[PDB]
Design an enzyme around this catalytic site. Structure first.
Site, PDB file in Angstrom:
ATOM      1  N   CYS A  42       0.815  -1.189   0.000  1.00  0.00           N
ATOM      2  CA  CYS A  42       0.000   0.000   0.000  1.00  0.00           C
ATOM      3  C   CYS A  42       0.865   1.261   0.000  1.00  0.00           C
ATOM      4  O   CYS A  42       1.955   1.281   0.571  1.00  0.00           O
ATOM      5  CB  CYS A  42      -0.913   0.003   1.221  1.00  0.00           C
ATOM      6  SG  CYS A  42      -2.201   1.269   1.109  1.00  0.00           S
ATOM      7  N   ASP A  44       0.087   3.632   1.787  1.00  0.00           N
ATOM      8  CA  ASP A  44       0.084   3.933   3.227  1.00  0.00           C
ATOM      9  C   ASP A  44       1.443   3.641   3.858  1.00  0.00           C
ATOM     10  O   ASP A  44       1.884   4.357   4.756  1.00  0.00           O
ATOM     11  CB  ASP A  44      -0.989   3.107   3.949  1.00  0.00           C
ATOM     12  CG  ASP A  44      -2.353   3.744   3.883  1.00  0.00           C
ATOM     13  OD1 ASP A  44      -2.417   4.981   3.804  1.00  0.00           O
ATOM     14  OD2 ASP A  44      -3.369   3.017   3.880  1.00  0.00           O
ATOM     15  N   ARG A  46       2.532   1.694   6.105  1.00  0.00           N
ATOM     16  CA  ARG A  46       2.432   1.971   7.539  1.00  0.00           C
ATOM     17  C   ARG A  46       3.655   1.499   8.322  1.00  0.00           C
ATOM     18  O   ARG A  46       4.208   2.259   9.113  1.00  0.00           O
ATOM     19  CB  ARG A  46       1.110   1.456   8.144  1.00  0.00           C
ATOM     20  CG  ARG A  46      -0.128   2.082   7.529  1.00  0.00           C
ATOM     21  CD  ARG A  46      -0.123   3.611   7.556  1.00  0.00           C
ATOM     22  NE  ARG A  46      -0.474   4.163   8.861  1.00  0.00           N
ATOM     23  CZ  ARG A  46       0.300   4.964   9.597  1.00  0.00           C
ATOM     24  NH1 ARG A  46       1.508   5.344   9.176  1.00  0.00           N
ATOM     25  NH2 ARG A  46      -0.148   5.396  10.770  1.00  0.00           N
ATOM     26  N   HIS A  98      -2.496  -4.471   4.654  1.00  0.00           N
ATOM     27  CA  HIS A  98      -2.360  -4.061   6.044  1.00  0.00           C
ATOM     28  C   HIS A  98      -3.709  -3.629   6.605  1.00  0.00           C
ATOM     29  O   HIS A  98      -4.588  -3.186   5.858  1.00  0.00           O
ATOM     30  CB  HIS A  98      -1.323  -2.943   6.162  1.00  0.00           C
ATOM     31  CG  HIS A  98      -1.807  -1.624   5.655  1.00  0.00           C
ATOM     32  ND1 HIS A  98      -2.254  -0.628   6.495  1.00  0.00           N
ATOM     33  CD2 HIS A  98      -1.933  -1.140   4.396  1.00  0.00           C
ATOM     34  CE1 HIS A  98      -2.632   0.417   5.779  1.00  0.00           C
ATOM     35  NE2 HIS A  98      -2.436   0.139   4.502  1.00  0.00           N
ATOM     36  N   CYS A 101      -6.435   0.541   6.737  1.00  0.00           N
ATOM     37  CA  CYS A 101      -6.104   0.977   5.375  1.00  0.00           C
ATOM     38  C   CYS A 101      -7.173   1.930   4.836  1.00  0.00           C
ATOM     39  O   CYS A 101      -8.349   1.560   4.694  1.00  0.00           O
ATOM     40  CB  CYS A 101      -5.942  -0.234   4.453  1.00  0.00           C
ATOM     41  SG  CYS A 101      -5.315   0.193   2.810  1.00  0.00           S
TER      42      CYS A 101
HETATM   43 ZN   LIG Z   1      -3.433   0.923   2.816  1.00  0.00          ZN
END
Ligand SMILES: [Zn+2]
Ligand SMILES: [Zn+2]
Ligand SMILES: [Zn+2]
Ligand SMILES: [Zn+2]
Lengths: 222, 222, 222, 222
Positions: A42, A44, A46, A98, A101
Site C-alpha cells: 500500500c 500507506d 504503515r 495491512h 487501510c
Molecule cells: Zn493501505
C-alpha cells in the site's frame, strides 16, 4: 519551507554518519546487484517493507499504490512485475496488505473522495462479492477483514496476468505470496499456500480464502 | 522456501523486539495521523525514502514505479496524488529519482526487454528531447543526467495534472519538489525552486533545467 | 500497395459525389455543433453505429474497445465519457454489446492470446460471477449470453464512475443505456430501464440481469 | 425518451429494408470474415471511417479516443492493437486525425475542461515541441497543422510499441499509415511513406514531418 530544510538536515546528518561508519553499504549499493524480491504494498506504507522484512541492502524491488492492487489492466503495476521478473530475475513477488487501510474502508463505506473513487471501485467489486460474509462481523473489523481478502484476490490477479502466465510457461523460477499484518504488532501473516506454477494458482486462491473466510468470522491478525 | 522463511523470522525477531523495547511505536501507529509528504520514487528503491529523510514516524505517503514517472494519464500515480492531496491533505510532493537507474539506462540504450519497453518510451521521449546536450558528455555519465532531467520533467508533469492545478486554483496549500541523489553518498540535491502555486510552475521548470543542463555538462551528485 | 490505393479511390469517388449532391452535409459538419449521444461499442463494429441508429450527420461521439468495456480505471474510456458529458454535454450515453464477440468468447474459453488477455480478465471476472447460469446454458450460446450480462455490468460501471455521479449530483441533464444486438437482424434490444440520476442506478442494474439471467436460459437477440 | 424511441424506429426500418431487400448483408457478416485494417481515429468521428474509405463490409477493425491518440502506455488502445495484429491478423493499421478537432484545439487553448486535460496533456507536449513552427502560422490554422503533426506523432508511437515491434520481428507483413482529412471534403491525405518493417520507421516519421512541417507553413487539406 523549514520542514524541507529539516528533511535535507536529516539527509545530511545521515549520509555523513553512514559513509563514516558503514561505507561498505554505499559501495556495494553502487554496484548493479539485482534485488531478490518484488513487494506490492500500500501507498500507506504503515510499516515500511525493509522494517518488516529486515532487508536493508536494496534487496526489495518495490511497487506502491492505494490498497495494494494488481488491477487487470493497470500498466504501471504490470510493468513493475514484468521488469522485476523478466529483467531482474526476481524469483519472489509479494502482495502485502495491512489493517487500518484508508482505501479499504472507502471501498466499503463509499464516501465522496473525488477521482480516487474510481480506483476503489475495483476493491468495492470484491466488497460486493463478499458482502454476506462481511455483514456478519462487528463493523469495526469488516474493513480489516476485506484487507485480508483484498490481498488474496490480488495475488490471484497477479497470478492470472500474462506477465506471470508467460514466465511460468517458459519454465522460469517465479512464485507469488500474499501477506497481511495488523497495527498492534506489525507481524506478517502468510495467506494461502505456495504458488510456483500455473496449476497451483486456483488452489492457493481457495486455500487463502478458506483461511480468511473462516467459519467463525475471526480476523487473522487481531 | 527458506529465503521466505527468513523474512518471517526476521519479522518476528524484529516485531517482538520493538514490543519489548519501544511498544509505543505501534501505539503511535494506532492514532493514524495523516502523512505530510507524498514521495513518488523508483521501484529500484536503492536507499529507502525513510532512511534518506529521517521520516520514520508515518510522515510519508509512498508511491513507486519503474523510473519514478508522473505519466500524464497514469490513473495509478494520479490517484495516489489525488488521494494524498485532496483527502490526506499532504502539503508537499517530492519526485525522487536516483543515479544508477536501470529503467533510465534502458531508455537511452533501447534494448528489447518485453512489456516494460512501452512504459520507458515515455522517458525515451525525454532522451530524444535533450539528446544534443546529452551526447556531449561521456557515455558513462549520460543516464545519470537523464536521471536528473527525468526528475525535472516528471515534476513539471505533476504540476500540470488537473489534480495539482485544481488544488492550487482552490487555494489549498500544496507544493512540489524534485530531489535526486547519487548512490555513493545518498545525499539529496534539490532541483529548481519553490512551487507552491500554478504561477511558480514555469519558473521551477526552467531553473531546474538551468542547474541540470549547466554550461559545464556536470553531474550534480558525483 | 493495391488495397491501400483502393481506399484513396473509394474516398475520392465518395467525397465528390456527396459533395456535388449534398454540399450541405459538409458545411453543417464544419460547424462542429455538439453531438447528441456518446456511443461506446466494440472494436468489432459488426454493423456501424450510424446504421444501427440511422444517424449520419455527426450526432454520435464514439469510443470503441475490445468487448465494449467501461473499466473503472480505464482513463481512455473515462476521458471520452467526461469530455462528452462535461464539455459536449451529451444527454445519452449508450453501451452497446453484440452477439458473436471474439473478445467475449475468449473470456470464457480462456485461450492464451497475448497482451489482450489482461484486457479480458475483466470480462472473465463477469463470467466467473455468473458461471453457474452460463454452465447450465447451452455451450454454443454461452458467448452471446455473457455479451448480454457484459452490457449490464459495464452500464453499472458507467453510472458508478466519478463522471456520472458528479453530473447526476450537480443535476446536469444526462442519462445512460444498455443496448445489445445480433448479427442476423441487427435489431437493437434494450437491457434495463430509465436512469437519469443516482437514484435509479440500482433498479436498472437489477432489472437487466433479471431479464438476462432469465429462467428460460434463452438469448435475447436470436 | 422521444429521441431514444426514434433510434429504435430508425433501427427497425433499417433492419426491415436490408433483410427484405439485400439479405446477403446479414448472411455475410454472420460468417467469420476477419477485418484487414485497423483504423485508429478520433471520438469526434466527423466523417465515419466506413464512408471515408468505402469499406462497408466488415473490413475495418476500429478503435477511437480523444484527438486519436497512440499513448505509449494506454492499455485500451494497446489491447485493441495487439488483438488486431496478433489475433485477427490485420495487414494495415491506420491512424487518422482530422481538421477541426475539439481535443486538439483545447490542447492549445488550455481551458479548464476537467479530467480530459490530463489525456490532452500528451497533445500539448507536441504543441510545446512544435510551437515555433506553429506560431509562424496564422492564429486560425495552428490547430489544423497540429492535427497533422499529431498523426505524425501518434503514428510514430504505434510503430514504436512492443506490439508492432514484435509483429515485425516475427516475420509478419503488417503496415502502418497516417491519414488526415479536412471537413470541406472528407478528402483523405497520406502523411509519410510505406512503413512495413522496423527499419522503415524513422524515415516515414521524417517524411511526414517533412511534408507536414514544410517551409511555406501551408496546410495540406485546405
Ligand atoms: Zn493501505
Ligand atoms: Zn530507478
Ligand atoms: Zn465484439
Ligand atoms: Zn477529433
Amino acid at each position: 519551507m523549514p520542514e524541507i530544510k529539516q528533511l535535507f538536515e536529516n539527509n545530511s546528518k545521515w549520509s555523513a554518519s553512514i559513509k563514516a561508519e558503514t561505507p561498505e553499504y554505499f559501495a556495494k549499493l553502487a554496484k548493479g546487484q539485482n534485488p531478490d524480491f518484488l513487494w506490492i504494498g500500500c501507498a500507506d506504507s504503515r510499516v515500511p517493507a525493509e522494517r518488516l522484512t529486515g532487508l536493508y541492502s536494496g534487496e526489495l524491488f518495490v511497487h506502491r499504490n492505494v490498497a495494494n492492487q494488481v488491477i487487470h489492466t493497470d500498466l504501471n503495476c504490470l510493468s513493475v512485475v514484468q521488469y522485476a521478473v523478466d529483467v531482474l530475475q526476481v524469483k519472489h513477488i509479494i502482495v502485502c496488505g495491512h489493517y487500518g487501510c484508508g482505501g479499504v474502508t472507502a471501498a466499503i463505506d463509499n464516501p465522496q473522495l473525488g477521482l480516487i473513487n474510481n480506483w476503489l471501485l475495483h476493491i468495492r467489486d470484491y466488497y460486493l462479492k463478499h458482502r454476506e460474509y462481511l455483514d456478519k462481523m462487528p463493523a469495526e473489523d469488516r474493513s480489516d477483514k476485506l484487507a485480508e481478502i483484498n490481498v488474496a484476490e490480488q495475488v490471484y490477479n497477479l497470478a492470472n496476468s500474462t506477465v506471470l502466465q508467460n514466465a511460468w510457461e517458459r519454465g522460469q523460477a517465479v512464485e507469488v505470496h500474499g501477506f497481511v499484518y495488523g497495527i498492534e504488532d506489525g507481524r506478517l501473516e502468510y495467506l494461502g499456500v505456495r504458488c510456483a506454477s500455473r496449476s497451483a494458482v486456483e488452489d492457493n486462491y481457495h486455500k487463502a480464502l478458506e483461511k480468511i473466510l473462516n467459519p467463525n468470522h475471526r480476523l487473522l491478525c487481531r
